[PDB]
Symmetry: D2
Subunit: 261 residues, 4 copies
């Protein structure tokens, strides 16, 4: 798509994106599930081509507020790939060894190699999101990181990495409903922690942090896509569509090449 | 389904397992696909429990002759899991850095952590398989590795790893048909390399190497399962059944407010 | 000099080794410093041969009670090597990621490669030492680890690693004097941690843990050497002599041009 | 200390540095060996402070033509440190796995952590040196790497790394004598490769590549120091002096906190 791609003009406004927007797809849930199965079959062939050709490196970054759909998006990408060529690198609370080096160290370690597709569940962007919102480093420090990120991603892209960054955009009320469903389910309540409730108060600070991160780092070589994600079906379809179209654009070729006894 | 577990008596004979055997399933392909969907739903809940509890470490080892089903088995495992808690560690031709350390170094690095399920696509067993068949090290060296492997796996099991080793067993003629299909498909012919044709001449040497590896290392703490795998549907169902039953046996427990 | 190698008979008694023993050296500190300088020049040639030949893997394990000499021994090895071919892998308090895998995982990661000498400052032995003494896992668990260690080390040795394990043996009163010296030095008191005082009470439990570990794991392919270490000069000389003699035994040669 | 620091004005000229220059030291070899022992004793205390304080990260980069002194410089640094807090990360011919990721991947992996001093024996600079000289990638690719390097180093410095880059400067005739000495010594002959002979014909191309890299990447946060290195004694003294003075400038403090029974 083009309406969801954030232009590299530094004029991005998050208020312009409605989490309930479903306008790029004509039809609803059922037609989208059918379109998604078609995309999965296309993705299987494209991922196998990615691997067999062994030249491109594909990085998919997923960022979202908790219950925003990162987990669900990973599952629908995996529905259309060979797990031997695709992996998830997730980024959680940094360890002492990770904090003992620059914040990009643990992230750079996990970049896709040639013929590989890697999904970052959270990423280096957390170092300008939770780090900024919770003041884990002073502003003097984290404000410099927007340039570090643009330049790290420029180097990655110049050296052969195709970068797709998706912000799965849900509303506060949608998050409320999804978090209540987790609490009410005995098989999901383990996902609740001490402080999750008081973190909801920081909703607006996170939205500002996301808007600043996206505006600062959406570039030609590393675009951000804002995905209206209140509807799981639309989020899954749209992310799959963008990923498949991006892979098609690489114009990948099988390597150039008998009766077995 | 216990007929496929190799007893730790060192009396295993590969000739006793028919790759065409489908006797553990009282039906065919259609009924097995339905049973497999049920196993996939059970596996999703079990894997999430594995992660949420965060105590067990699960290692699934896949070994098979080329076209034997490792790739297809990985896909049916992933059909029943969350990719955030399961990963594939594949073992290919060792690099100079890997050969500069003991053969278990590159393998030990990839073991599952607590709350994780790892699939080894090939494994430390290649160090008594291709290494043995192609004489990549003298026999004096690779013969000692059966004990190294039993002891490495004993340490893993003692320290909390549940180990499942599957030998996906196909016939020489089944491999021939499957390799011919790869060659004839323009989207799969990239898999073929000249040298595969010479590798076919070594079929019997590999069967002997597999029999000796299985006989030497199938233990109570790290059993081998011989999977008749000429039928993709049977291999998928049986591996999924064993994995789900193993995870059920762990009796995992979930760890021990109105939002405005 | 072979009186310090613990025979693989499972009959080792730590009481038979006196931390004040200097009997293998017929002289004192000054003559030993000169002998150590000769061993240092020998080690430089042997380490370069190790690297150039690029076939052997050398693992040196250091274990000692705090202030026992691991740090001083590392310096004395480094005085006779090219730092480009020798490295220190130190083992501290396990992290969550390290504890999430078997205790050998973090250790196996660090093994020397061909043409390399690695010094383990502490090692997998801590998993039968501080783990046993502080009951970090039940005895049913840590008792099984003696066999794991023998078998891990057998595999390493079979696959080409020369293993040397040194237990730098100091007395309780020597440790007390050395720890008091750290506290009294403004440039060293940063080493003192809260809990080091209460850990002094566990001295005898550590001595028992060391004896049991050494008795269980000193083998023909992976010997333990008990180093009387109350005298820094004697510990440095003896470790250096054993290391140099071990490397000489490998009969290494420069690759042919 | 100032005459050897390459100013970040992009006007660097390698012809202005004489490999035989010993002007920063009054006296010769013997007085310098004594001054070096004094610097080693100072370095031991400073490195221990670096470790005990556990806050700064120190990166020393060594680049030189073969026989230029990287090996000798490493030994002289190690003469004044505790090996438990200092390590050498050397960069050789990239492996298939290293080439399957961006050239900075293998380098970033090895950066010093808090309280650590790391010496890079060769570095990311090889990706604009041999890579450029032997045309291992097209110019369109390697020309973009000067910016990647400035920006990677900016990020490292902003996030707490003190960076020292030393170009150990030897003349063509000095290299010739040193390489001849290796061939003539039975204990050093093993270092000789046959491609080494034909690599001598590329001397001028390497000098141009070094001048371009120094000019492009000597910045305020990551300076290059050109070390006249025809005299081993002067190279050892000068590198040790710069390192010690840099560590002194960090104003490191021991962490602030009894009769043992
Ligand atoms: N750079 C970072 N600094 C601090 N915390 C971080 C950083 N990167 C990730 N985290 C945090 O790690 C945690 C991971 O927690 P967990 O695995 O339970 O997922 P989660 O709570 O569902 O995350 P999310 O809110 O993104 O959905 C998140 O709370 C995230 O904010
Ligand atoms: N079955 C599972 N296996 C492995 N990791 C899991 C599993 N279920 C959840 N997780 C992890 O637990 C944490 C909390 O779960 P959560 O559903 O919030 O996922 P998520 O990736 O953060 O997605 P979302 O954006 O919807 O919050 C995340 O770190 C997630 O990756
Ligand atoms: N320890 C080892 N020593 C030597 N070769 C090894 C070792 N481990 C794996 N290999 C080889 O690495 C190769 C991996 O090749 P590839 O990824 O193309 O898969 P493959 O040919 O389909 O393997 P397989 O025959 O198991 O299906 C195999 O030929 C395997 O024998
Ligand atoms: N789409 C893919 N993405 C990543 N790796 C792939 C993909 N398809 C195949 N491979 C890898 O290519 C190699 C050859 O493929 P192959 O079909 O033989 O798989 P396999 O795992 O060896 O299974 P089998 O036991 O059937 O031979 C293997 O290393 C496999 O993992
Ligand atoms: N397997 C392990 N389990 C628990 N603690 C461990 C383990 N391995 C090492 N440690 C501990 O890590 C710590 C390292 O601490 P530190 O770097 O300050 O050195 P130290 O106190 O001087 O150690 P030592 O007493 O051996 O001289 C020691 O207290 C040691 O007991
Ligand atoms: N200058 C230094 N650089 C790096 N690490 C250091 C330095 N000095 C001490 N250490 C580390 O600090 C810790 C405490 O120091 P310590 O003197 O006890 O060393 P050690 O290796 O445990 O030797 P010993 O057996 O004498 O206790 C150890 O982990 C040691 O490696
Ligand atoms: N990025 C890179 N691309 C290609 N070759 C590289 C790269 N980095 C390092 N190398 C090469 O790796 C080799 C390392 O070889 P070796 O260990 O024998 O040291 P050397 O020949 O003495 O190096 P130098 O010439 O720097 O003194 C050098 O020839 C160096 O040019
Ligand atoms: N004793 C040794 N142990 C380990 N590595 C060594 C040893 N001697 C030399 N090397 C390595 O062998 C290679 C060739 O040696 P060389 O003398 O050229 O070193 P160097 O670091 O490249 O220094 P210089 O700048 O003088 O060329 C380098 O990679 C060097 O690090
Ligand atoms: Mg979440
Ligand atoms: Mg990577
Ligand atoms: Mg195969
Ligand atoms: Mg490699
Ligand atoms: Mg091998
Ligand atoms: Mg200590
Ligand atoms: Mg050199």
């Amino acid at each position: 798509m083009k309406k969801y791609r954030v232009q590299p003009d530094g004029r991005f406004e998050l208020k312009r994106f409605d989490p309930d927007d479903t306008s790029a797809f004509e039809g609803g849930k059922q037609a989208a599930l059918e379109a998604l199965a078609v995309l999965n079959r296309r993705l299987e062939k494209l991922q196998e081509l990615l691997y067999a050709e062994g030249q491109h490196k594909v990085l998919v970054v997923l960022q979202a507020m908790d219950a925003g759909g990162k987990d669900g998006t990973i599952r629908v990408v995996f529905d259309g790939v060979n797990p031997s060529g695709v992996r998830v690198a997730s980024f959680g609370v940094p360890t002492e060894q990770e904090l003992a080096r620059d914040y990009l160290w643990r992230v750079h370690q996990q970049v896709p190699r040639k013929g590989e597709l890697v999904i970052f569940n959270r990423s280096h962007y957390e170092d300008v999101l939770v780090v900024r919102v919770k003041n884990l480093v002073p502003q003097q420090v984290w404000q410099k990181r927007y340039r570090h990120i643009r330049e790290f991603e420029r180097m990655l892209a110049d050296e052969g990495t195709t970068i797709l960054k998706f912000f799965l955009h849900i509303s506060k009320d949608e998050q409320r409903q999804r978090l209540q469903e987790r609490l009410d389910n005995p098989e999901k309540r383990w996902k609740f922690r001490m402080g999750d409730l008081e973190d909801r108060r920081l909703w607006d600070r996170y939205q500002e942090a996301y808007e600043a991160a996206i505006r600062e780092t959406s570039t030609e070589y590393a675009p951000w896509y804002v995905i209206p994600a209140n509807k799981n079906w639309y989020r899954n379809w749209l992310v799959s569509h963008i990923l498949v179209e991006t892979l098609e654009g690489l114009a990948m070729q099988y390597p150039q090449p008998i009766v077995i006894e």
